[PDB]
Amino acid sequence: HSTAETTLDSFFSRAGLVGEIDLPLKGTTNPNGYANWDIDITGYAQMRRKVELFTYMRFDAEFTFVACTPTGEVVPQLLQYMFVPPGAPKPDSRESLAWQTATNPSVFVKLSDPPAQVSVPFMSPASAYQWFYDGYPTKDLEYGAMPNNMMGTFSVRTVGTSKSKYPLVVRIYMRMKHVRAWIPRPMRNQNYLFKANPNYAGNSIKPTGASRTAITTL
Amino acid sequence: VAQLTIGNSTITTQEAANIIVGYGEWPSYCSDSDATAVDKPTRPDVSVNRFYTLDTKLWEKSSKGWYWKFPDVLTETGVFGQNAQFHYLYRSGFCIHVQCNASKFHQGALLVAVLPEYVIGTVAGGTGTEDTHPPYKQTQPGADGFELQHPYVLDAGIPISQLTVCPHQWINLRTNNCATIIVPYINALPFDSALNHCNFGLLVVPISPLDYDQGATPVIPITITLAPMCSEFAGLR
Amino acid sequence: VAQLTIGNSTITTQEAANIIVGYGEWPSYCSDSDATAVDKPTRPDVSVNRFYTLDTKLWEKSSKGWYWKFPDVLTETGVFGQNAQFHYLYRSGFCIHVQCNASKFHQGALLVAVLPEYVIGTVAGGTGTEDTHPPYKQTQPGADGFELQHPYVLDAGIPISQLTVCPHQWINLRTNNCATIIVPYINALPFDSALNHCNFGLLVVPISPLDYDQGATPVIPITITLAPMCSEFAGLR
Amino acid sequence: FTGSFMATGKMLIAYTPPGGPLPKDRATAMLGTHVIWDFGLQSSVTLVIPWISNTHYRAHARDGVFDYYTTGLVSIWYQTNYVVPIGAPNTAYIIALAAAQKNFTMKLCKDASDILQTG
Numbered sequence: 001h002s003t004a005e006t007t008l009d010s011f012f013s014r015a016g017l018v019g020e021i022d023l024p025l026k027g028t029t030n031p032n033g034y035a036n037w038d039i040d041i042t043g044y045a046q047m048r049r050k051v052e053l054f055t056y057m058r059f060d061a062e063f064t065f066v067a068c069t070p071t072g073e074v075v076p077q078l079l080q081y082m083f084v085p086p087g088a089p090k091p092d093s094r095e096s097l098a099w100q101t102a103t104n105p106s107v108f109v110k111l112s113d114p115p116a117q118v119s120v121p122f123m124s125p126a127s128a129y130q131w132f133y134d135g136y137p138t139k140d141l142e143y144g145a146m147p148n149n150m151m152g153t154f155s156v157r158t159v160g161t162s163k164s165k166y167p168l169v170v171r172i173y174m175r176m177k178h179v180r181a182w183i184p185r186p187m188r189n190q191n192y193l194f195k196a197n198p199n200y201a202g203n204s205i206k207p208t209g210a211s212r213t214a215i216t217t218l
Numbered sequence: 219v220a221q222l223t224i225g226n227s228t229i230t231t232q233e234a235a236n237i238i239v240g241y242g243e244w245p246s247y248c249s250d251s252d253a254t255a256v257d258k259p260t261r262p263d264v265s266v267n268r269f270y271t272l273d274t275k276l277w278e279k280s281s282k283g284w285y286w287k288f289p290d291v292l293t294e295t296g297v298f299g300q301n302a303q304f305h306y307l308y309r310s311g312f313c314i315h316v317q318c319n320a321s322k323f324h325q326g327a328l329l330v331a332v333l334p335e336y337v338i339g340t341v342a343g344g345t346g347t348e349d350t351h352p353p354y355k356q357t358q359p360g361a362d363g364f365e366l367q368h369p370y371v372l373d374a375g376i377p378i379s380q381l382t383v384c385p386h387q388w389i390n391l392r393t394n395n396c397a398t399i400i401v402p403y404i405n406a407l408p409f410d411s412a413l414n415h416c417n418f419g420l421l422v423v424p425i426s427p428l429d430y431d432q433g434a435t436p437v438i439p440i441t442i443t444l445a446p447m448c449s450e451f452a453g454l455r
Numbered sequence: 456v457a458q459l460t461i462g463n464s465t466i467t468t469q470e471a472a473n474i475i476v477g478y479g480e481w482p483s484y485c486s487d488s489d490a491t492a493v494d495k496p497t498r499p500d501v502s503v504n505r506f507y508t509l510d511t512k513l514w515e516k517s518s519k520g521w522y523w524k525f526p527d528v529l530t531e532t533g534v535f536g537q538n539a540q541f542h543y544l545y546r547s548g549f550c551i552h553v554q555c556n557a558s559k560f561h562q563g564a565l566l567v568a569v570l571p572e573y574v575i576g577t578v579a580g581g582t583g584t585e586d587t588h589p590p591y592k593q594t595q596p597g598a599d600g601f602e603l604q605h606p607y608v609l610d611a612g613i614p615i616s617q618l619t620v621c622p623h624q625w626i627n628l629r630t631n632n633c634a635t636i637i638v639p640y641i642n643a644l645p646f647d648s649a650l651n652h653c654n655f656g657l658l659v660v661p662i663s664p665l666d667y668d669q670g671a672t673p674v675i676p677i678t679i680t681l682a683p684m685c686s687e688f689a690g691l692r
Numbered sequence: 693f694t695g696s697f698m699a700t701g702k703m704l705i706a707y708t709p710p711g712g713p714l715p716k717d718r719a720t721a722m723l724g725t726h727v728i729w730d731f732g733l734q735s736s737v738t739l740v741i742p743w744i745s746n747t748h749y750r751a752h753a754r755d756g757v758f759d760y761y762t763t764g765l766v767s768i769w770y771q772t773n774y775v776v777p778i779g780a781p782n783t784a785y786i787i788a789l790a791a792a793q794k795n796f797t798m799k800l801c802k803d804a805s806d807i808l809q810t811g
Contacts, residue, residue: 055335056406126406132335134287135415139353144337183334183404184383190375193346200375202341205368208377219733226725230702230733271704271722274772296723319700319732321777431778439772441702443728560779564694564787619789629697630735663694666781 008179012050015064015173018043021156023168032094033164034157038150039120041174042195049192055183056128059176061151064117065109066171075111075166078159082106086123086150094157108159119177123151128182132198144197227269229443231315232396240332240385243402245311245447252408259307259409259452266298267446272361277318277326277438283366283423285373287336287416288312290358291444298446306453308412312401313445316422320391320438327426328440329378330397331386334404336419339374341367358416369423378423390426391438400447409452464506466680468552469633477569477622480639482548482684489645496544496646496689503535504683509598514555514563514675520603520660522610524573524653525549527595528681535683543690545649549638550682553659557628557675564663565677566615567634568623571641573656576611578604595653606660615660627663628675637684646689693731695776695784700732702771705739710762718769728771731784739766740793 004010021035041061042048051057065081068074084090084104091098098104109116122129126148133146154172158164189208190200212218221230247261270292275284289310293302302308316330340352356364366373372381387397405417420442428438458467484498507529512521526547530539539545553567577589593601603610609618624634642654657679665675693699704718706726715721729737741764748761776782 128406130335130406132337133415134335134337134357134417134419135411138411138414139351141351143351143357185333186372186376186378186380186383188375189377190371191346192375193342194349197349197351198337198339198374198376199342199349200339200371201344201346202368203344204346205371208379221727221734228727230728230730230737232733271728271771273719274702276773295719317730319702319730319772319775321698321700321775323777433778435773435775435777437773437775439701439775441728441772559697562694562696562699562781562784564785627694627735629693629695629699662787663785666696666783668779668781671779 008181009177012059012176012179015062015175016044016047017171018047018174019154019170019172021168021170021172023156023158023164023170025163025165025167034091034094034155035170036090037154037156037172038090039152039154040195041151041176043172044174049188052131052188053184054181055132055185056130057179057181058122058128059179060119060121062117062119062175062177063154064115064173064175066115066173067111068169069167070169075168077111077164077166077168078108079111079170080106080108080155080157080159081116081170082155082157083118083120084153084155086152088153090153091155091157099155099157104155120151124148132185224445225265225268227271227445229269229271229315231317235394235396235398236387237398237400238385238387239400240402241404245400245402245449247448248309248408248450254307254409254452257452259309259450261448261450262298262301262446265296266301267449269443269445270295270298271441271443272363274439274441275363277320277328277424277428277440278436279428281365281424281428283369283421284363285336285359285366285422286361286363286420286442287358288418288420289412290416291361291363291420292446293413294360298449301451302412304455305412305451306455307409308449308451309403309405309409310449311403311447312399313447314399314401314420315443316389316397317441317443318389318391318395318438319441320395321434322392323434324391324428324430324438325426326391326424326428326438328389328397328422329381329386329425330389330399330420330422331381331384332399332401332418332420333381333384334418336416336421337374366421366423372421381421389422409450461682462502462505464508464682466506466508466552468554472631472633472635473624474635474637475622475624476637477639478641482637482639482686484685485546485645485687491544491646491689494689496546496687498685498687499535499538499683502533503538504686506680506682507532507535508678508680509600511676511678512600514557514565514661514665514677515673516665518602518661518665520606520658521600522573522596522603522659523598523600523657523679524595525655525657526649527653528598528600528657529683530650531597535686538688539649541692542649542688543692544646545686545688546640546642546646547686548640548684549636550684551636551638551657552680553626553634554678554680555626555628555632555675556678557632558671559629560671561628561665561667561675562663563628563661563665563675565626565634565659566618566623566662567626567636567657567659568618568621569636569638569655569657570618570621571655573653573658574611603658603660609658618658626659646687693735693784693786695731695786696780698780699774699776699784700730701774703729703731704769704771705729705737706767706769707739707741708765708767709742710744710760710764712765714765714767718771721767721769741766 129149130146133144136142193199292298338352372378389397529535575589609615626634706721744762746760750759
């Protein structure tokens, strides 16, 4: 008799992994013991098609950070997770003064200390993050680019002047809280090709679902 | 039957089929305590809000479907295409009316719907490895509209078998010819560029193919008459 | 639909289209203080005032038009053609009814009008130098009527594009089949010879030619039923 | 419209006030006083011509004639094509009747005619 499971907030909560940062010792991958992750909620595979059910949404997001070594081991290393709100400048080097700007919130936590956890608000200047945009921001390479959907950047790094002594892996989960949505639209039935556009594969156009032999044989 | 007039524009239509008011809201205006209470947004009444009757597209057995972008279909046309260009912001509604003129001997079905932020995704090179952005003639096809090429995915990788989730109305030839819809301004913002952003798009696809025996006129003139509702502008140039 | 009866004459017609009462006057009678208060003019009620249904003329693509003279069309027929001849004076009115029996697949238009003192002027020899007086078969064509030869000038040197200035009614096949008119006695005199003078003439011309695809019946039976109204006679012989 | 009863379509009858030039096409005519006539719904349609005045004096040849210049313009376009099912003629005719409203007036009798009484 109850229908609470089918509510938007219900449908969307749950922390899902949307990001993973590798900070190896020896590597081609993030060689400066630091990393920048502009916040993308498409990181959770499943997510892209789910949200694209609507045109406009709004929400807050609680992020939780899980860090360890590749073997999934814990170590005595300190860390600085920094959030550079949209508009602020991302650190270009392991010593960019951006690490020290007070207006870039930063939370320091030892790897041993349980996961750090913070809530980020509805950034967007528009009244809602909107998934589709039928225009260009004042044949062009800027079609469907709704700009005002930036959530920020998350700069991660070992604390200290010198390189960290260990190989590290940060994972970023994200629970979506207080979700409101508008204008529903046809569920993506075609495979996704790019992060920006609905561009599909005009060759491999597949029927929405399974097929059969005759409209009389079940 | 009975004819209605809004200015110098006089269309002949049926008494009053069932209209579809998109999302139950009526294209109303924007009150005084908004973001621009300094530059009073002038609300075009005179001729700006009247009947525009577009180049009637012809239905065929082989037709795939058609779509127009808004407010793009008019930013070209008339004294509204005058304000849409030489004005900085815009908010409008639309009384869209689609009609077919066919005998009781042709058969078919047209699904007529409105889709906000209708972003056209092209084919992408074929194999999927070309990040081709649709041209400007596909993104904003003027008042001549444009023909879907992949009606099944609405040229955007989405099943049309689900488009009914948008404001829509059917045009079954054996039951009706006229189909009408009322659209309220929809966007994440109270105002927006009437040139750089097409709030929505009018889609009219033949779901049951047009057919007729040999001899009957092979085409069905689909006439799209539409008119702005409680439309608003702001910041002349 | 519903059928009306005046004596032994029972015609099947439509409920009541729009009738045309020629010059707004109703064929009434002539009061006691007239020119012949001695020889009381007996007013035929019984069978004299009933439905006469004439030999249905057949419409064709090539038809020019038709005209009958009054009271000539009946001075031949029935018990009114009995009084019209063996009586010295006459005054009458007429409920004229013209019908077409054609499918929704034939197309055409008939203008049906009444013209007082319809004097037929012939062609006059051709070049114009022969003062030929129309025969007696053209001047008073009986109940078989007669075909105009020069419909454009109504065989009288007058544009038909102006005939609508007389009591008239239209018979557009796509809108109606029946057309009705009520004529009041009209003459410079209260009474007059029912044989030597045709007060008026019934004109029914095809203005939009009859057409139809091959297969549809090529002719449209035009049935003219008419009946006398408040008719009066005086002076038996 | 005196065509088959099985026919439908739409016509765009536009009036281009005195001075205004005949619209280039159906689209530009669609922006000025016009009427979409669906001879599929109504067999008849009436248009009112707001005003015409033959009063501007012209002394051209040597014969001073009082002429319009108020040549209003009535254009008629095929808004849609003529749709007719099998078995119905692919051509209908239309009759146009005219008359002047009640606000009409005339001034200055001028007996004139090509047709006079012959010898």
